[PDB]
Design an enzyme around this catalytic site. Structure first.
Site, short mmCIF file in Angstrom:
data_model
loop_
_atom_site.label_atom_id
_atom_site.label_comp_id
_atom_site.label_asym_id
_atom_site.label_seq_id
_atom_site.Cartn_x
_atom_site.Cartn_y
_atom_site.Cartn_z
N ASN A 45 -28.72 -25.80 24.45
CA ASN A 45 -29.69 -26.30 23.48
C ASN A 45 -28.99 -26.99 22.30
OD1 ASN A 45 -31.34 -23.33 24.28
ND2 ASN A 45 -32.21 -25.35 24.70
N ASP A 85 -29.67 -20.67 26.97
CA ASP A 85 -30.64 -19.83 27.65
C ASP A 85 -30.00 -19.29 28.94
OD1 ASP A 85 -32.60 -20.60 25.70
OD2 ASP A 85 -32.97 -22.43 26.85
N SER A 96 -27.33 -22.79 20.85
CA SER A 96 -27.69 -21.65 21.69
C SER A 96 -27.69 -22.05 23.17
CB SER A 96 -29.07 -21.09 21.28
OG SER A 96 -30.12 -21.98 21.64
N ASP A 148 -29.33 -26.55 19.22
CA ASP A 148 -28.95 -25.69 18.11
C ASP A 148 -27.69 -24.87 18.41
OD1 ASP A 148 -29.96 -23.82 19.89
OD2 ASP A 148 -31.30 -22.85 18.45
N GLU A 150 -38.94 -21.41 34.72
CA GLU A 150 -37.79 -21.29 33.82
C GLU A 150 -36.47 -21.46 34.55
OE1 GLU A 150 -37.44 -21.17 30.66
OE2 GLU A 150 -39.55 -20.97 30.09
N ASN A 182 -32.69 -16.50 25.29
CA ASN A 182 -31.97 -17.36 24.36
C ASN A 182 -30.95 -16.59 23.53
OD1 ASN A 182 -32.06 -18.67 21.30
ND2 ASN A 182 -31.94 -20.20 22.95
#
EC number: 3.2.1.17
Length: 129
Positions: free
Chosen positions: A46, A52, A50, A48, A35, A59
């Site tokens: 991201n 991370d 968002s 959308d 990750e 998220n």
């Protein structure tokens, strides 16, 4: 901070992740490797809107509040900036909520693609725990 493999293993053990909700410690070390490459400051944007955050790439749509993500639910009740600390405590406590949510470590795409199905206990081999 960039953790070493066994250093992180030990830190995660002290925070109660070994076998938490059925996931042995090696799962968590493997997830953090793919990750974030063990980096507490990793961030990823991201489509959308968002982002991370941190060593477990938590998220901002569902789990932490970063004040810029539409539809935020903030289920960990924590500002995302706290997840970029060199101390992993806030990330671990939120991760415990994520895995209890009802799909386990499947919330971590890199875990389900690159860790699930392999011998994950190799990730803690040779560490003093």
């Amino acid at each position: 901070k960039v953790f070493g493999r066994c250093e992180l293993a030990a830190a995660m053990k002290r925070h109660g992740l070994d076998n938490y909700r059925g996931y042995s410690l090696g799962n968590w070390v493997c997830a953090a490797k793919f990750e974030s490459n063990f980096n507490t400051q990793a961030t990823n944007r991201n489509t959308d809107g968002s982002t991370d955050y941190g060593i477990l790439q938590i998220n901002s749509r569902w789990w932490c509040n970063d004040g810029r993500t539409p539809g935020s639910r903030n289920l960990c009740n924590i500002p995302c900036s706290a997840l970029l600390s060199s101390d992993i405590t806030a990330s671990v406590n939120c991760a415990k909520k994520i895995v209890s949510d009802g799909n386990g470590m499947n919330a971590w795409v890199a875990w389900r693609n690159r860790c699930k199905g392999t011998d994950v206990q190799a990730w803690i081999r040779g560490c003093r725990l």
